[PDB]
Design a protein around this ligand. Structure first.
Ligand SMILES: CC(C)CCC[C@@H](C)[C@H]1CC[C@H]2[C@@H]3CC=C4C[C@@H](OC(=O)CCC(=O)O)CC[C@]4(C)[C@H]3CC[C@]12C
Ligand SMILES: CCCCC[C@H](O)/C=C/[C@H]1C(=O)C[C@H](O)[C@@H]1C/C=C\CCCC(=O)O
Ligand SMILES: *[C@@H]1O[C@H](CO)[C@@H](O)[C@H](O)[C@H]1NC(C)=O
Lengths: 238, 307, 339, 59, 128
């Protein structure tokens, strides 16, 4: 049994060396926040990625205030998302990019994004995952609404009786027609989020554009707020 | 005229009753026992906050069940702590004073760690994520208990003294010396300066945590049921006021005794002030289970139904 | 109407298959096994708990020696355990952190894994230097890797989310055979004991029987109502069981070409993530979304026991070759050995 | 449109291959499954719990 | 075997009315949420309407709200869509789609191409 003692001791030493390495990887895992990049194909996916800069997944790494973030873009997968969307249930946030100008398109790209957001919000494995909502294409939306071409109320009949919210912050030098176009689309996503939230996960909408160059700061601030409310749930002991 | 006239006395002074010392024990025992029943039901059948609260309730329950029966036995038998146990004689008064100062200091250190934890988890969430572990919160109570046991044992090595207070039913650190000895007054000031810094840092960390809890609520304003940010802030404001109000009287007694001359003090008045100060310090253990455990239970929450 | 003519013949052939199945359904499995003794109460206790994974576990596979197992977690780690001593033998960091499947070679020399990167990576555990490196990575799938199983040291069969299974040559890295016919993401596969056929369950509520040598589909089974998440052969190779999202496990017969028995309960409304048989085949173990694992009487459709020890969703199951113990993996980053 | 025509021909050709197979009775098929479980009942430790000194996971 | 069969489509004048039916078999019709989807001759698949397991939760897309009416019959496993005052842009192939899982609030891949739980569809033509 002398050789059996050496085999157990050698197996114990090899286990100790692995557990030393696993402690270092635990600190790297804790100090890094993973994000999922999602949305329709016609939105500015590369616009969000380039603000920092065959394969089945793409990774983007950036650091804000000495905090490391991983953003993952789904490269080569079929449009049936009901099976592989469950792998992103423990991410810090899901970044949902919506082409806000495509309320009417050759069809309803906005309703497809609303239905996709509804399934993500109400999925049983994604009920604890917060969503950061980026409503892109502000310049395209402003050009469409002001010129009078097409319409929003043909695809959204509630737009006729909709008014500007009291807690609104319009940007300077813009008529009160493009502003109502942005807030109505934002309120369409907010009606889904406020129906079945229950205090588990939250939605953070933002009016991003192609020339903002500050979306990494807004993602950092929202991710800071997500972690704060996760820490607050530990003070309800019973 | 000696300042501590119940120092060598053998019986309780006439005109005192155990009603005040029995109400504090009964309300503190039923509060902590109910909390440990609720705390063991959910945890058996966690988090860093859970480990800190478990260690605080055990300290609060152990302090009540170790010091209060010794006081109540004195009133019933009409014998002071010097002559309460003839087998132990003076050693019972010294051990009573050592544990009275230990439980005061160990609770304050544990209440500061819970203030730092709430401030760090809400004020610096990214720093809290990569540095504070469940392992750290599990060993906060043993480390602060080892320091408090070693710090409060300084008069045993020759730095400070323990004396029996009127009416002979309790003992504590001697805070007044007639000749102004540096050995006696040095430790009494050092114990209370450390307690003042722990109280000051606990208030500042609670205020820093309450500042984030209000900022969290205001961002949500722009847009049974679980507790919101405001009723967490209401429980922190209640704890901050009561912890400050119940800790200042014992800090004032040491600074008053050390620096003001003994020739300008009326002994009859000072006997009641020393006793009142340590009655106040015992209210922290009574209200600790309600602030941290009982008021956060859905069993209790269905009565008031919140707002 | 040329497309309609092809649809009419497809509908006519489906009625012929249905009538031939009904002609052979002279009795039922529940009628024949009515007079046998009940299995009784099955009570298993947790013997080992394996800790060390930082995130949720998706897959595990037992070794053929019934001692070592490999587990895949979404923290980007492959860990090979010694289940008798709870010791970690290897810890393989992965290039992609989204691994969804893992396999252990029957020779014990290689370990495969794959996930959202659409690549099955082979790892050599018997290198002369002593370190585990990527021996070979296989590319060609256009969807995520959902399952993979070694045939030997040179062949491996992989399923993928592109509605396609494939057979690989590990030495050259090329696809020897491609298995097509499914219309949904193929979620699981199981190899027959003789390793000449394999079954696959996809997200079209269908299971198909494949020929490895000929590369053709032989039989199709359509008993379920929702996506099939797991599949496993009977020990004698003449039957298999499937788990689905309709809170129902079913048993299918290869020679009878129809479903034999349905395992369901009124209070179970959660899907099945993994199924496995015992050594005899009398017990059918299924992992569920309500954090539990149920033991079924495969011949009587009576629930025999419950394995309730996980705080999150049970994602994978496995019974050892000698039938000594069953291992459960869950989303709480824990592995338990039940017995 | 021509893509769906070629797909529909594959489905019909696959159905003709599956329809021309020999199926045994369910009564005989079910009798084989219960005969296998009976012949291998004593070799299943999950059915019959083995005692100590031969269970590797008992300490 | 899960099967959905649609009927009721055909040529109709502008402003006309059509009633569509969807006979379901192979699954418990009352445990699932049902959808209507359409595909324009040049565009992709577009979601139209949905109804819950027991009804009383009905949502239409913006272009058909107030004109289309979805109905359910759990006793006979039939899904209905009442079309009223049809327009020439309603010309599409209308499919009866079922949500992938029972007792669920979400329906992910209903409008995705090559969806297994969708019927063959019926042609609706609105022209004069
Ligand atoms: C009865 C008298 C004579 C005992 C002697 C005094 C000390 C030796 C005792 C009294 C107070 C006890 C402490 C009271 C509370 C705790 C917290 C306790 O931790 C928990 O229960 C929560 C879980 C965790 O944080 O680990 C660890 C033991 C400890 C330090 C105890 C250690 C032993 C102490 C210091
Ligand atoms: C002071 C150290 C921290 C608190 C420790 C512990 O919880 C408190 C115990 C006190 C009670 O609750 C009942 C009893 O009064 C006991 C002793 C406290 C103060 C002296 C009163 C003696 C008297 O009545 O003549
Ligand atoms: C108590 O006795 C000590 C000596 O044992 C003496 O120094 C002290 O003054 C006495 N106190 C009183 C109040 O008599």
């Amino acid at each position: 049994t002398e050789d059996q003692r050496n085999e157990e001791k050698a197996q114990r030493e090899a286990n100790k060396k692995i557990e030393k390495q696993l402690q270092k990887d635990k600190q790297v895992y804790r100090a890094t926040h993973r994000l999922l990049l999602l949305g329709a194909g016609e939105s500015g996916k590369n616009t969000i990625v380039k603000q920092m800069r065959t394969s089945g997944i793409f990774e983007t790494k950036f650091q804000v205030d000495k905090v490391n973030f991983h953003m993952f873009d789904v490269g080569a997968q079929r449009d049936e998302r009901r099976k592989w969307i469950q792998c992103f249930n423990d991410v810090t946030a899901i970044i949902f990019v919506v082409a806000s100008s495509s309320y009417n398109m050759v069809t309803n790209r906005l309703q497809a994004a609303l239905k996709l957001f509804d399934s993500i919000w109400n999925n049983k494995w994604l009920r604890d995952t917060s969503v950061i909502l980026f409503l892109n294409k502000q310049d395209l939306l402003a050009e469409k609404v002001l010129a009078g071409k097409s319409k929003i109320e043909d695809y959204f009949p509630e737009f006729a009786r909709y008014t500007t919210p009291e807690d609104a912050t319009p940007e300077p030098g813009e008529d009160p027609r493009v502003t109502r176009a942005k807030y109505f689309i934002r309120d369409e996503f907010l009606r889904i989020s406020t129906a079945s939230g229950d205090g588990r996960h939250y939605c953070y909408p933002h009016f991003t554009c192609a020339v903002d160059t500050e979306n990494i700061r807004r993602v950092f601030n929202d991710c800071r707020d997500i972690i704060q409310r996760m820490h607050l749930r530990q003070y309800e002991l019973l | 005229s000696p300042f501590y006239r119940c120092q060598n006395t053998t019986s309780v002074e006439k005109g005192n009753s155990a009603v005040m010392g029995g109400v504090l024990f009964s309300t503190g025992l039923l509060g902590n026992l109910l909390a440990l029943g609720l705390l063991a039901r959910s945890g058996l059948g966690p988090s860093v906050f859970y480990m800190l609260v478990c260690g605080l309730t055990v300290t609060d329950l152990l302090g009540k069940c170790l010091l209060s029966p010794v006081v109540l036995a004195a009133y019933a038998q009409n014998r002071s702590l010097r002559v309460l146990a003839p087998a132990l004689d003076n050693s019972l008064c010294q051990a009573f004073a050592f544990f009275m100062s230990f439980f005061g200091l160990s609770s304050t250190l544990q209440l500061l760690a819970m203030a730092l934890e709430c401030w760090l988890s809400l004020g610096h969430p990214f720093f809290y994520r990569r540095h504070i572990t469940l392992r750290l919160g599990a060993l906060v109570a043993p480390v602060v208990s080892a320091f408090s046991l070693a710090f409060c044992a300084l008069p045993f090595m020759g730095f400070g003294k323990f004396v029996q207070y009127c009416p002979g039913t309790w003992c504590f650190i001697q805070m007044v010396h007639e000749e102004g000895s540096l050995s006696v007054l040095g430790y009494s000031v050092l114990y209370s300066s450390l307690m003042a810094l722990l109280v000051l840092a606990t208030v500042l960390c609670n205020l820093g945590a309450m500042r984030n809890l209000y900022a969290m609520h205001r961002r949500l304003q722009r847009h049974p049921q679980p507790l919101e940010e405001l009723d967490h802030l209401l429980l922190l404001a209640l704890m901050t006021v009561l912890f400050t109000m119940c800790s200042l009287p014992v800090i004032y007694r040491a600074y008053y005794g050390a620096f003001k001359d003994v020739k300008e003090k009326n002994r009859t008045s000072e006997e009641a002030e020393d006793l009142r100060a340590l009655r106040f310090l015992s209210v922290i253990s009574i209200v600790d289970p309600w602030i941290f455990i009982i008021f956060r239970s859905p069993v209790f929450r269905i009565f008031f139904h919140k707002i | 109407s040329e497309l309609d003519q092809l649809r009419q013949e497809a509908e006519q052939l489906k009625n012929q298959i249905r009538d031939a199945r009904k002609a052979c359904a002279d009795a039922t499995l529940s009628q024949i096994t009515n007079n046998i003794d009940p299995v009784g109460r099955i009570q298993m206790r947790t013997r080992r708990t394996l800790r060390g994974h930082l995130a949720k576990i998706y897959a595990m596979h037992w070794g053929t020696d019934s001692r070592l197992l490999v587990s895949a977690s979404q923290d980007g780690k492959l860990i090979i355990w010694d289940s008798y001593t709870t010791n970690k033998v290897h810890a393989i960091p992965l290039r992609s952190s989204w691994v969804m499947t893992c396999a252990y070679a029957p020779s014990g020399n290689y370990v495969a894994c794959g996930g959202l990167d659409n690549i099955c990576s082979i790892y050599n555990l018997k290198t002369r230097e002593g370190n585990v490196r990527v021996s070979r990575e296989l590319a060609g799938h256009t969807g995520y890797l959902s399952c993979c199983r070694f045939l030997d040291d040179n062949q491996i069969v992989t399923s993928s989310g592109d509605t396609t299974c494939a057979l690989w040559d590990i030495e050259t890295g090329q696809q020897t055979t491609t298995f097509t016919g499914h219309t949904g993401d193929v979620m699981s596969l199981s190899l027959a004991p003789d390793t000449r056929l394999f079954v696959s369950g996809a997200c079209d509520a269908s299971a198909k029987l494949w020929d490895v040598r000929e590369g053709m589909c032989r039989q199709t089974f359509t008993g379920h109502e929702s996506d099939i998440n797991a599949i496993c052969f009977f020990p004698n190779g003449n039957a298999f069981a499937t788990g689905s999202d309709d809170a129902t496990c079913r048993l299918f017969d290869l020679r009878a070409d129809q479903e034999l028995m349905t395992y369901s309960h009124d209070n179970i409304i959660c899907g099945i993530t993994s199924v496995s048989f015992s050594k005899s085949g009398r017990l059918l173990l299924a992992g569920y979304d309500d954090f539990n694992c149920n033991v079924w009487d495969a011949l009587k459709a009576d629930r025999a026991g419950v394995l309730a020890g996980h705080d999150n969703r049970v994602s994978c199951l496995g019974v050892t070759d000698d039938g000594m113990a069953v291992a459960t993996g869950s989303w709480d980053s824990f592995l338990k050995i039940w017995n | 449109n021509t893509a769906s025509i070629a797909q529909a021909r594959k489905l019909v050709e696959q159905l003709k291959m599956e329809a021309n197979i020999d199926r045994i009775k369910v009564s005989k098929a079910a009798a084989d499954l219960m005969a296998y479980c009976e012949a291998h009942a004593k070799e299943d430790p999950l059915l019959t719990p083995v005692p100590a000194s031969e269970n590797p996971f008992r300490e | 075997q899960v099967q959905l069969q649609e009927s009721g489509g055909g040529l109709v004048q502008p402003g006309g009315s059509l009633r569509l039916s969807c006979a379901a078999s192979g699954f418990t019709f009352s445990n699932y949420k049902m959808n209507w989807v359409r595909q324009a001759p040049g565009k992709g698949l577009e979601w139209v309407s949905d109804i819950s397991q027991s009804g009383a939760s009905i949502s239409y897309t913006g272009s058909v709200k107030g004109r289309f009416t979805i109905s359910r019959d759990n006793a006979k496993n039939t899904l209905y869509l009442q079309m009223n005052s049809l327009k020439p842009e309603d010309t599409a192939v209308y499919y009866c789609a079922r949500c992938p899982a029972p007792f669920t609030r979400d329906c992910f891949d209903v409008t995705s191409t090559t969806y297994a739980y969708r019927g063959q569809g019926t042609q609706v033509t609105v022209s004069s």
